[PDB]
Design an enzyme around this catalytic site. Structure first.
Site, short mmCIF file in Angstrom:
data_model
loop_
_atom_site.label_atom_id
_atom_site.label_comp_id
_atom_site.label_asym_id
_atom_site.label_seq_id
_atom_site.Cartn_x
_atom_site.Cartn_y
_atom_site.Cartn_z
N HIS A 123 0.79 -1.08 0.02
CA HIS A 123 0.07 -0.03 -0.02
C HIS A 123 0.89 1.22 0.09
O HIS A 123 0.40 2.32 0.00
CB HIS A 123 -1.04 -0.06 1.02
CG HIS A 123 -0.75 0.40 2.38
ND1 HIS A 123 -0.41 -0.46 3.71
CD2 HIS A 123 -0.33 1.57 2.99
CE1 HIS A 123 -0.35 0.26 4.51
NE2 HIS A 123 -0.07 1.75 4.16
N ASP A 166 -0.24 -7.40 1.67
CA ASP A 166 0.14 -6.10 1.63
C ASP A 166 1.91 -6.24 2.04
O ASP A 166 2.27 -5.96 3.09
CB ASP A 166 -0.26 -5.35 2.84
CG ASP A 166 -0.17 -3.94 2.80
OD1 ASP A 166 0.39 -3.31 1.98
OD2 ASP A 166 -0.64 -3.10 3.90
N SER A 193 3.70 1.90 8.28
CA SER A 193 3.49 0.85 7.39
C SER A 193 4.76 0.43 6.79
O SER A 193 5.65 1.46 6.29
CB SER A 193 2.41 1.13 6.68
OG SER A 193 1.19 1.16 7.36
C1 LIG Z 1 -0.25 -0.72 12.19
C2 LIG Z 1 -0.15 0.48 12.19
C3 LIG Z 1 -1.41 1.36 11.53
C4 LIG Z 1 -2.58 1.79 12.04
C5 LIG Z 1 -3.42 2.33 11.35
C6 LIG Z 1 -3.29 2.63 9.94
C7 LIG Z 1 -4.05 3.37 8.79
C8 LIG Z 1 -5.42 3.84 8.93
C9 LIG Z 1 -6.42 2.78 8.34
N1 LIG Z 1 -7.80 3.12 8.74
C10 LIG Z 1 -8.80 2.42 8.17
C11 LIG Z 1 -8.30 0.98 7.43
O1 LIG Z 1 -9.76 2.42 8.37
C12 LIG Z 1 -3.09 3.32 7.68
C13 LIG Z 1 -3.21 4.22 6.63
C14 LIG Z 1 -2.53 5.24 6.20
C15 LIG Z 1 -1.14 4.95 5.71
O2 LIG Z 1 -0.09 3.77 5.77
C16 LIG Z 1 -0.52 6.35 5.06
C17 LIG Z 1 0.04 6.09 3.99
C18 LIG Z 1 1.49 6.26 3.47
C19 LIG Z 1 1.89 6.07 2.29
C20 LIG Z 1 1.09 5.39 1.30
C21 LIG Z 1 -0.27 5.61 1.49
C22 LIG Z 1 -0.91 5.66 2.72
C23 LIG Z 1 -1.52 7.30 5.39
C24 LIG Z 1 -2.82 6.48 5.59
O3 LIG Z 1 -3.97 6.84 5.90
C25 LIG Z 1 -3.56 2.95 5.30
C26 LIG Z 1 -3.80 3.24 3.89
C27 LIG Z 1 -3.89 2.38 3.05
C28 LIG Z 1 -3.89 1.10 3.23
C29 LIG Z 1 -3.76 0.72 4.58
C30 LIG Z 1 -3.44 1.72 5.62
N2 LIG Z 1 -1.90 2.88 8.00
C31 LIG Z 1 -1.90 2.47 9.35
C32 LIG Z 1 -0.93 1.95 10.25
#
Ligand SMILES: CCc1ccc2c(CCNC(C)=O)c([C@@H](C3=C(O)[C@@H](c4ccccc4)CC3=O)c3ccccc3)[nH]c2c1
Ligand SMILES: [Zn+2]
Length: 226
Positions: free
Chosen positions: A45, A89, A182
């Site tokens: 992602h 992922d 992530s």
């Molecule tokens: C384990 C710790 C943890 C907990 C919660 C989340 C959530 C929030 C998830 N919220 C939901 C799914 O309701 C995320 C989401 C998120 C990113 O990773 C960021 C990002 C950076 C680079 C490219 C794209 C995106 C900005 C963003 O909003 C995300 C989006 C797309 C798929 C998966 C995750 N990561 C997480 C990690």
């Protein structure tokens, strides 16, 4: 990382800081880890139009001699990665050149063994992500100790799967990874067993991590062919 501590500078020399570039918005951020001199493992992602990798960092706002800013030539996203379920992922980044080995920069290769990790034990995760739901990404590398939970603890994630993913973080503890983290590794006794994937928007543990053991064949396939 929420509720963690500042890492000892350069104590995790495989850690990669990823800047994710897209056509229609500003930079976003992920973690990753160097598994070969020219390969970084991360989350699918975190794919973008282009990605820049910084190795050897602690405080990401202060340039220093340990930094290696490295170009990515190609992204290898898992072919079955699904934006609806978030299954698979996982992604490999090939670097244009091989990284220099220094005290501050080195690889974390997998051991031969690829046994399934059961619930119960404590593991550690590191990253530069948000230090709270309403707080900004950290300037310094942070880390936290989290418990591997029984899969029923993650049932509320309707697309969670015990065979594909780890369930990470005791619900009673205010400790977790979050956005910006992530793609970073979860290490259990010094061995990478998980990749930070996703959790609740409000950061309440537990959260979902990719189970590396399941993907060892795919990882090997990409490395051997590239
Ligand atoms: C384990 C710790 C943890 C907990 C919660 C989340 C959530 C929030 C998830 N919220 C939901 C799914 O309701 C995320 C989401 C998120 C990113 O990773 C960021 C990002 C950076 C680079 C490219 C794209 C995106 C900005 C963003 O909003 C995300 C989006 C797309 C798929 C998966 C995750 N990561 C997480 C990690
Ligand atoms: Zn330094």
């Amino acid at each position: 990382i929420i509720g963690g501590t500042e890492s000892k500078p350069h104590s995790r020399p495989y850690m990669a800081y990823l800047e994710i570039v897209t056509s229609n918005g500003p930079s976003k951020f992920c973690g990753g880890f160097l598994i070969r001199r020219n390969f970084v493992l991360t989350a699918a992602h975190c794919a973008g139009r282009s990605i820049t990798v910084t190795l050897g960092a602690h405080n990401i706002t202060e340039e220093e001699d340990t930094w290696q800013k490295l170009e990515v030539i190609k992204q290898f996203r898992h072919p079955k990665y699904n934006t609806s379920t978030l299954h698979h992922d996982i992604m490999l980044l090939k670097l244009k050149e091989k990284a220099s080995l220094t005290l501050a920069v080195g690889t974390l290769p997998f051991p031969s063994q690829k046994n399934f990790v059961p619930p119960g034990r404590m593991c550690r995760v590191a990253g530069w992500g948000r230090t709270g739901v309403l707080k900004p990404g950290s300037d310094t590398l942070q880390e936290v100790k989290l418990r591997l939970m029984d899969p029923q603890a993650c049932s509320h994630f309707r697309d969670f799967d015990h065979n594909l993913q780890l369930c990470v973080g005791n619900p009673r503890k205010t400790k977790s990874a979050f956005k910006g983290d992530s793609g970073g590794p979860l290490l259990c006794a010094g061995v990478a067993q998980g990749i930070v994937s996703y959790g609740r928007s409000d950061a309440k543990p537990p959260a979902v991590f990719t189970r590396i053991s399941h993907y060892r064949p795919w990882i090997n396939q990409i490395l051997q062919a590239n």
